[PDB]
Amino acid sequence: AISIKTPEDIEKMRVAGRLAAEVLEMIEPYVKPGVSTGELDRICNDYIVNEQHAVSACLGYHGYPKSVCISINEVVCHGIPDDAKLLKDGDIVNIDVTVIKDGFHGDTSKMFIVGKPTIMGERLCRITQESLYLALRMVKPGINLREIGAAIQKFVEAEGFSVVREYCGHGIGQGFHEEPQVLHYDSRETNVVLKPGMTFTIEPMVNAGKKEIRTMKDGWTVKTKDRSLSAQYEHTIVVTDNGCEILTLRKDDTIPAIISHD
Ligand SMILES: c1ccc2[nH]c(-c3cscn3)nc2c1
Ligand SMILES: [Co+2]
Ligand SMILES: [Co+2]
Ligand SMILES: [Co+2]
Ligand SMILES: [Co+2]
Ligand code: NA
Numbered sequence: 731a732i733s734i735k736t737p738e739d740i741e742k743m744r745v746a747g748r749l750a751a752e753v754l755e756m757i758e759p760y761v762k763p764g765v766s767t768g769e770l771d772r773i774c775n776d777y778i779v780n781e782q783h784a785v786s787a788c789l790g791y792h793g794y795p796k797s798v799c800i801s802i803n804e805v806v807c808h809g810i811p812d813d814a815k816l817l818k819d820g821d822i823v824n825i826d827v828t829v830i831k832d833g834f835h836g837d838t839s840k841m842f843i844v845g846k847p848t849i850m851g852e853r854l855c856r857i858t859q860e861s862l863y864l865a866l867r868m869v870k871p872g873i874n875l876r877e878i879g880a881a882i883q884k885f886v887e888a889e890g891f892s893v894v895r896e897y898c899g900h901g902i903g904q905g906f907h908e909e910p911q912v913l914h915y916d917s918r919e920t921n922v923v924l925k926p927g928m929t930f931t932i933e934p935m936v937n938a939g940k941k942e943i944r945t946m947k948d949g950w951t952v953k954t955k956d957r958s959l960s961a962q963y964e965h966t967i968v969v970t971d972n973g974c975e976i977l978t979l980r981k982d983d984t985i986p987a988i989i990s991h992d
């Protein structure tokens with residue numbers, strides 16, 4: 731559009747964003763060696779539907795068959811939960827949740843390391859999260875999204891890693907994937923000035939190796955071409971008069987929910 735949310739709209743996004751975040755806090759103790767991604771997905775859907783009184787935006791959307799996306803190791807994104815896929819020590823696992831409540835969407839993802847961490851896994855997860863946080867700290871009215879993507883890329887590359895090009899952040903509200911596209915790297919194509927009341931996600935995908943990615947024969951599951959590890963974190967935000975408010979913050983986040991400039 732780009733769609734500006736009213737205060738009422740924003741309050742409903744606060745509620746959907748909290749619910750999405752709560753799914754991620756809930757699922758954590760279940761993420762252990764020997765659990766399958768299929769069970770994790772069931773637990774999440776059961777929780778969203780029967781405790782939260784909400785629904786998964788994933789389920790049925792363009793025919794997607796499950797309720798969350800679960801992406802392990804070299805899978806970059808859109809991993810499909812499966813009863814036969816079991817987690818094991820050292821795995822890094824992204825769970826991407828999107829909840830609809832009262833017509834509004836809340837979208838967020840985080841990494842989990844399973845059992846005994848490996849050093850590359852810990853590092854990649856930490857740097858990815860730090861790249862999301864740096865971008866969040868830049869959001870305010872007047873800024874251009876190009877600057878934010880540029881800053882993500884500079885940081886990630888300086889840390890020896892690479893930024894997935896083909897996937898980005900997005901506006902969100904009564905629609906799951908709204909304008910604008912929120913690129914996580916510098917592009918001359920990008921020119922979006924932020925205004926208060928915009929709501930969008932930042933969701934960098936970072937590869938320990940080379941940025942290149944291959945989609946699977948299923949035209950969907952995405953892996954890293956060099957089979958390097960890939961990590962992602964995502965938050966949903968609203969642009970405020972002097973900053974942003976994070977709508978999907980968790981107790982384990984180490985960034986304030988409200989960021990203020992001046
Ligand atoms: C579940 C179902 C359909 C989904 N379509 C998206 C998507 C489009 S651009 C970035 N993400 N993600 C999905 C997750
Ligand atoms: Co997606
Ligand atoms: Co998401
Ligand atoms: Co998203
Ligand atoms: Co360490
Ligand atoms: Na991954």
